[PDB]
Structures are given as C-alpha cells and as structure tokens.
Design a protein around this ligand. Structure first.
Ligand SMILES: OC[C@@H]1[C@@H](O)[C@H](O)[C@@H](O)CN1CCCCCCCCc1ccco1
Length: 763
C-alpha cells in the first residue's frame, strides 16, 4: 500500500492531454487543466485560420513530437509550424513535494524560422480551466490600468489539489505597441487576462470560448465607432480587453514581435517554497541527464544499430510512444440492449445485427477514467485495447511500475460480464474527434488480449526515488505478487468472457477433433471486414458464416491460458491451473485438427460449406502464421519449419522491407482498401522477430534457419522505419512492401515504436 501511494503521488501531474499540442491535467476527472494556443496574425481575418490548439497533420505542420520524455519527470517537445513560421519548444518538469502530487513548470519558447517575416506578430494564449463544485480560482489584478507589465498570478483552491498558485511569467520578447486611439481605452499593448465562468461541462471547448471573447471585443469596436476609415492594427483588434477576476476559466493572452519565451509555474502550496524560473531550468537540465543515463541502460542498441544516428532514432521513437500517455475522463457510448441479433447465430447475421444497431438503443454510461498511451496524437488520441498490448512492451522496459499502472487502469474498466470496450472514447472532448456513427461500443466485440504479453514479460522479470519507483514492483516480490493476486480474478474473468462470447460451433456440423470445446469465432464481422480481430480487411471465409472458425482468435486464447498457468502457479490456484492445463492441451490439438492445412502448409481459418461440411479457407499472410506468432508451437514442430519456409519465401510474404500482411500469391493481394492485404505492419513483424529469436537461441532443427531470418528481418524492419524517419520525420502506420515508403497515417506511435525494442534486443 506504501508503494501504491508513492506511484499515485508520482504520476499525478503530467502533460496528459496528448490530443492537443501542449497542455496539462492531473489524473483527476474534474480538476485543473491547462492548454496552449498560438497563431501568427497578418490580417483582420487570418488568426481564426492560423491559431493552433488540437493536434492535426497537414502541409502546414512539418512535424512535432517529444524529444525526451518520462511521465515521472517531464520532457521537451519540439513543434515545427510552417504555417506560422515558428519553431517552438515546450519543456515540462515536475517538482515532487507536498501532499498533492507535487508541482511542475513549463517553458514555451518560440523562434521564427528563416522564412517568417522578422517582424511577425504572434498571438499566444494560455488557457486555464477548473471543474468542481467547491473549487475556486482567482486572477490577482495588476497595478497598471489595462493589463500586466509583469507576471500573471492565479490563486486557486480545491479538495483534490489543496491550495496552489499558477504563474504565467512576463516573458522575454518584443511586445508590439499601438499608437492608435484605442490605446487610450485598451492600452498600447500588454499581457491581458479574462476571467470567465461557464457550466463545467463546456470548459474543454477552449477554441469556441476564446473566439466568443474575441468576437465580443470586435463587436465592441464596431459599437464604438472604430471602422475602416482608420482601423487599429489586427493584433490590437484581437487583443482582449483586460478583465481579471474569479471564474472557472482564465484566458491569459500575450502578443509578441519576433522570437519569444515565457514560463508557467505551478506551485503546490502544500509543498515547500514556491517554484521559480531558475528552478525550472535546473530541473529541465537534470531530467535530461537522467533520461540520457536510463536510455543507454534500458535501450542499449545492439549491432548494427550502435551508432548515434540510430540512438537519436530510438530516442525519438521512444519519447513519442511514451509521450502519448494521456488521462481521459467521462461517459462512453455503449449499446446495452444485448439484442439477440448480436448472437450472430444465423446465415446472413450481418443484416440482423445491422437491424439491431438501427434500433439505436445505445446511451452514455460511466463516468469512466483511463490512463493510457495512444496510437495517434493527430487522428485517434485514445486508448485501443490490443494496441496498448504493444505500446507497453517498450514502456515496461523503461518503467514496469508505470506499465502496471496502465494495465490496472485498463482492467478497472472491465464490466461484470468480463468485457472491456476495445476503443475508449471518454467524455465530450474525446467524442469531438469522432463521428457519432462510430462512437458506440458493443459488449460482444473482443480485441486481441495483447495486454497479457506485457504480464508475461513482468512474470519472467519477477522470477529472475524516481529510480526506486520505476522498478519497485519487481524489486519487492511481495508487492509484485500482491498486484497479480488482485489482477488475477479479472484476467480469469476476461478469459471466461472470451469462451462465453467468442465461441465457435464444433458440435453442430460434421466436425471431428480432439476437443469438443475449443473453437472460436470473432463476433462483429461484416461482408468485407472483421474489425475486432485487429486486422480490418484481411480476407476471411466468404460469405461470413456462424460456422466460421478463426485461427488467430484460438491462438489468442492460447496466449491467455499460458499466462493464467504462469500467474495461477505463482498464486497457487491449483484447482485453476489444472483446468488451464487441459485447455492448453486441447487448443494445441485443436489448432492442428481444425486449422492445419497439409495441402497449403499453414494454418487457415475455416467455415462450413454449401453441403454443410467444414472447409479450410487459406489466405497466406499474417493470419496463417498465428500459432507461431503467439509462441504456441514446439521448437521442433514439423509445422513450425513449414511456416519458416513461408515466412522466408520472397514470392509470398518476405519483402526487402518486412513481412507482407498478405501473400503476393493470394488473390486478395493489394485489393480494395488494401489495409491488411499487402502492407508491412510493425506490430505483427515484432511478434515474428521475437518468435524467430526464441527458436534461434535454442537447441533444435531450425536454430540456424531461425537465426538467419531473425538477423535479416530485424535488419529490414529497423532500416525501413529508420529511413522513413530520416526522410520524413515520422513514424508511419504501415510500410509499403514494394517501395518501402511509409503510408497511411503519420505520427503512429503507436506500435511502430516497437522498433526501439527490436534494435536493443537481448529478448
Ligand atoms: O490503431 C488503432 C487501430 C488498430 O487497433 C487496428 O489494428 C488497426 O487495424 C486500425 N487502427 C487504427 C484505427 C483508426 C480508428 C478510426 C478513426 C480514424 C479516422 C481516420 C481514418 C483515416 C485517417 O483518420
């Protein structure tokens, strides 16, 4: 309980709003949040198009991301904005102390790029909001008439945070001055604050709230005879009238000519002395040193990636992955009808289930909270179930206590039946990034249980103060077991939930096999898709059919039983461990009996035919290697070796750039949206690389073959991601097997980042 409270205290504050360029919030649903906004202003209508706040990716932004980050300490973020001619640094640092989760500081630095006019006007805004019934926040008024010559001090109080002061410093930088008649009523130009109150649930809507104030300002100009005959400068037209006070929103605005910097100092009163700029500098410096030392220890790049170029690459892939960590809070949209159509028991079941959806029974439920890393800051800044399985493997290396926090956070969402929604859209803010048609979660929709992989890694570590806290759950085996003891019931619940809801039909067709129980079929499939599997458009038996069996799903169950055995063993759940052992046995046999093709030489999904007999439907690709990817095969398996032939074969899956999702020989190669139908995906490649390495480092028939493919596949995967990073600055969602080019979505960190773990090795 001691270590648990120390983690709470340590992880409370962070820049946990990955959906915006820069902002802070604690791991409290209703509390204090900050956000940064900037935009050049050249005209009377331009700011609304230039201003930046939520993350996007267009021709306007060269790139951005974290150059170093640890959620316990802070980090530095770099933003390269073409539209606004600015290179921005956002440095954030945490100062432990008091009872309330410590303090923190940020420095915003903006440098004009060579293209920007030397005399650019740039509007910067710091937006602060506080939710809660019994909380207060006040801007201390200034001496001077029209705004601030110096720092803005906000004093606030809340049950969650105690007393605090949030200071936005005067800054370095030329501040432009107006000789217009308006300066008599608005001042010649200075820092300003507007204190406002709105009903709590709209506070997150910083852009509209801001724009509403600017609009009222411009309206006031027009009411008071300032016109096109003789107008003030644009930048003065968009400077807000100063009106500090109290409210649950505080708009702090500055305008700069040329380069600029300013600081935010959040001072927890319950702590010792208040935070200073000089403080922020020291801690920024200190954090970097610590980051540096830990990176070289945890991510020791092995040949041929020992070079500094690869080190910068790793540091970028790592910092963006871990930097995506967010805290989200609010209601989810869930259909709790449990319509019978979602049982998908009929032929044509996809029209049945569409009819139930068209009943629109869903409603908001919760609130819920989640602490999680995300795949994509610009496009999907939210938790995806099987994604997090992958995100946490490098994170777990860095800070196992951290990863366990995230696992806990995920498992806390599980409902009474055993279900966790595979996509976590929590609260109005999260919903703003998502069409309503795609918000609704479905209690019958699974997602690969990849979080079990991280537990598997923790379990091997457990067998064999920011320093202490990162590893406290492995260094103190009592602590480690107590975690598993508490988690175990939930793991088991989820296992049962898969077998209850994702069951395949053996007994009701002409199907002979060693076990009558073991067969699985992903609920949720449409004619062309099966989103729940993770592999959107990978070809599946056509037409979809309740007699389908999916070899990937079965292998995922295998992944879970094996973990339940390890974790059960460790807690001594003897009754349980024996159930597992009979299940793992049956899956082993059943994988072969239901999914093995001796003709094709790989594992296939199955359906039942027109004549009601079990057919194999083989599509040589990731799906076909699943038992191997998930480590279910014995190292001397004849089948394994046949699969090694497939993996290595250039005319099938082996591209210079990684394993192709689908074989070049399959009819569905590069068809339709071509999502999982040729491209190279780093997450599944990572599984292939890990499993090759296992075979390569053991006595057995395939040792040297596995070793060769490990060597080359590692090389191809790392190089492809790195060349693309070098050329484009980005991690990509997937990679083109013909050109090697990164495609689909940028800023995918995201499981692409597994590249730092591939390079560093000693699995
Ligand atoms: O990383 C999560 C998820 C993985 O779990 C799956 O394995 C993967 O197959 C698909 N990805 C991405 C899902 C994208 C969410 C849909 C809203 C995005 C809107 C858009 C579409 C184009 C650009 O923006």
């Amino acid at each position: 309980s001691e270590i648990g409270r120390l983690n709470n205290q340590s992880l409370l504050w962070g820049p946990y709003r990955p959906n915006i360029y820069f902002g802070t919030r604690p791991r409290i649903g209703k509390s204090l949040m900050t956000g940064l906004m900037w935009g050049k202003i050249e005209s009377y209508t331009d700011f609304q198009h230039t201003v930046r706040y939520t993350c996007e990716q267009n021709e306007g932004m060269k790139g951005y991301g974290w150059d170093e980050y640890d959620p316990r300490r802070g980090g530095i973020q770099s933003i390269h904005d073409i539209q606004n001619g600015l290179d921005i640094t956002t440095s954030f640092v945490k100062i432990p102390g008091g009872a309330h989760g410590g303090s923190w500081a940020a420095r915003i630095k903006g440098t004009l790029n060579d293209d920007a006019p030397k005399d650019q006007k740039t509007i910067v805004v710091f937006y602060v909001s506080q939710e809660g019934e019994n909380s207060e926040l006040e801007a201390v008024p200034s001496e001077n008439e029209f705004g601030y010559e110096g720092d803005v001090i906000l004093k606030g109080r809340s049950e969650a945070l105690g007393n605090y002061k949030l200071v936005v410093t005067k800054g370095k930088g030329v501040i432009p001055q107006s000789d217009h008649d308006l300066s008599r009523l608005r001042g010649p130009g200075q820092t300003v604050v507007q204190s406002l109150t709105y009903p709590d649930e709209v506070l997150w809507q910083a852009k509209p709230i801001l724009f509403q104030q600017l609009k009222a300002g411009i309206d006031w100009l027009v009411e008071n005879k300032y016109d096109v005959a003789d107008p003030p400068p644009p930048w003065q037209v968009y400077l807000l009238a100063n009106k500090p006070g109290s409210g649950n929103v505080h708009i702090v605005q500055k305008v700069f000519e040329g380069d600029f910097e300013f600081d935010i100092l959040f001072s927890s009163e319950s702590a010792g002395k208040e935070v200073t700029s000089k403080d922020l500098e020291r801690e920024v410096k200190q954090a970097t040193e610590v980051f540096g030392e830990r990176f070289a220890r945890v991510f020791d790049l092995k040949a041929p990636f020992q070079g500094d170029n690869y080190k910068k690459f790793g540091k970028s892939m790592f910092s963006n992955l871990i930097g995506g960590i967010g805290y989200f809070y609010g209601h989810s949209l869930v259909d709790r009808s449990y319509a019978p159509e979602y049982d998908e028991e009929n032929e044509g079941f996809w029209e049945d289930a569409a009819e139930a959806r068209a009943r629109h029974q869903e409603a908001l439920e919760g609130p819920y909270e989640l602490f999680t890393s995300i795949p994509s800051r610009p496009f999907f800044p939210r938790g995806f179930l099987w994604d997090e399985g992958f995100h946490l493997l490098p994170i777990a290396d860095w800070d196992i206590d951290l990863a366990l926090e995230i696992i806990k956070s995920w498992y806390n969402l599980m409902d009474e039946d055993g279900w966790i929604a595979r996509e976590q859209i929590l609260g109005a803010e999260a919903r703003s990034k998502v069409p309503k048609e795609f918000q609704t979660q479905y209690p019958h929709y699974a997602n690969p249980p990849t979080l079990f992989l991280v537990l598997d890694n923790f379990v091997e570590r457990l067998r064999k103060l920011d320093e202490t806290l990162s590893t406290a759950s492995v260094d103190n085996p009592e602590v480690g077991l107590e975690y598993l003891r508490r988690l175990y019931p939930l793991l088991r619940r989820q296992f049962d939930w898969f077998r209850k809801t994702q069951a395949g039909d053996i007994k009701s067709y002409d199907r002979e096999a060693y076990s009558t129980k073991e067969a699985y079929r992903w609920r949720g499939r449409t004619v062309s898709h099966c989103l729940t599997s993770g592999l959107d458009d990978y070809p599946r038996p056509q037409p979809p059919h309740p007699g389908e069996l999916h070899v990937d799903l079965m292998s995922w169950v295998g992944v879970m039983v094996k973990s339940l055995i390890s974790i059960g063993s460790l807690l001594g759940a003897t009754e349980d461990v024996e159930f597992y052992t009979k299940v793992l046995d049956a899956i082993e046999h059943n994988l072969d009996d239901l999914h093995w093709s001796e003709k094709e030489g790989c594992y296939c999904d199955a359906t039942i035919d027109e004549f009601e007999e079990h057919k194999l439907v083989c599509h040589k690709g990731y799906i076909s290697l699943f038992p191997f990817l998930t480590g279910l095969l014995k190292p001397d398996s004849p089948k394994l070796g046949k699969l090694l032939a497939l993996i290595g074969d250039e005319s099938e899956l082996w591209s210079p750039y990684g394993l192709r999702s689908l074989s070049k020989k399959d009819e569905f190669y590069g068809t339709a949206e071509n999502y999982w139908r040729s491209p190279v995906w780093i997450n599944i490649n990572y599984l292939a690389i890990v499993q090759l390495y296992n075979i390569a480092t053991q006595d057995g028939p395939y040792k040297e073959t596995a070793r060769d493919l490990y060597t080359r596949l590692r090389k191809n995967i790392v190089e492809t991601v790195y060349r693309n990073w070098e050329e484009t600055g980005f991690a990509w969602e997937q990679y083109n097997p013909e050109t090697g080019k990164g495609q689909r979505t940028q800023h995918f960190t995201g499981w692409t980042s597994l590249v730092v773990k591939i390079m560093s090795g000693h699995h």
